[PDB]
Amino acid sequence: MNIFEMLRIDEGLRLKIYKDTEGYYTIGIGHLLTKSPSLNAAKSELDKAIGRNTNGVITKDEAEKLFNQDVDAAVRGILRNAKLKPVYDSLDAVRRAALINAVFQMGETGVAGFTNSLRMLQQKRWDEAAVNLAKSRWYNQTPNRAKRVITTFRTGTWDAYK
Ligand SMILES: [Cl-]
Ligand SMILES: [Cl-]
């Protein structure tokens, strides 16, 4: 199991523009296109991301390319973030993947806002961090996914994905 397989499971793969859990235009493997309510805006952003006139449809290869880019951007964002880098550096490999997952889903800023949880992860207080992370909109809106990520931080293994 690895970060790629992990996010492929949580985000799925769709080759046509679709709406995410929040109602935003998305494509591929969780690649957010725009927060704008307009499909055209979405099509415009897609074309600009792929580099061709896409008609709102892409290929598997294209979806994987966006995916590679997005994972890469997520890692780089953590490393450049003052609040995140220290947490990430303190973690083992499995838990690092779980932090990447969260950033991918909610953005660097979003994750950085979980001050208290961040402190608990850094101190290695697994069970306590897990309880605190559950007290969030994130968990109430996407409970199955949040539970998987949270278990990953609690145990340090991939059991939730197996
Ligand atoms: Cl892009
Ligand atoms: Cl869910």
Swiss-Prot record:
Outcome of swapping residue 30 to F: Almost complete loss of enzymatic activity. The enzyme is destabilized by 1.5 kcal/mol
Documented effect of changing residue 11 to N: Loss of 84% of enzymatic activity
InterPro entries per the UniProt record, alphabetical: Endolysin_T4_type, Glyco_hydro_24, Lysozyme-like_dom_sf, Lysozyme_dom_sf, Phage_lysozyme-like, T4-type_lysozyme
GO terms under cellular component: host cell cytoplasm
Domain of life: Viruses
Protein keywords: Antimicrobial, Bacteriolytic enzyme, Cytolysis, Glycosidase, Host cell lysis by virus, Host cytoplasm, Hydrolase, Viral release from host cell
UniProt cross-references to Pfam families, sorted A to Z: Phage_lysozyme
GO BP terms: cell wall macromolecule catabolic process; defense response to bacterium; peptidoglycan catabolic process; viral release from host cell by cytolysis
Residues holding substrate: 32, 104, 117, 132
Family stated for the protein in its record: Belongs to the glycosyl hydrolase 24 family.
The protein's name: Endolysin
Native species: Enterobacteria phage T4
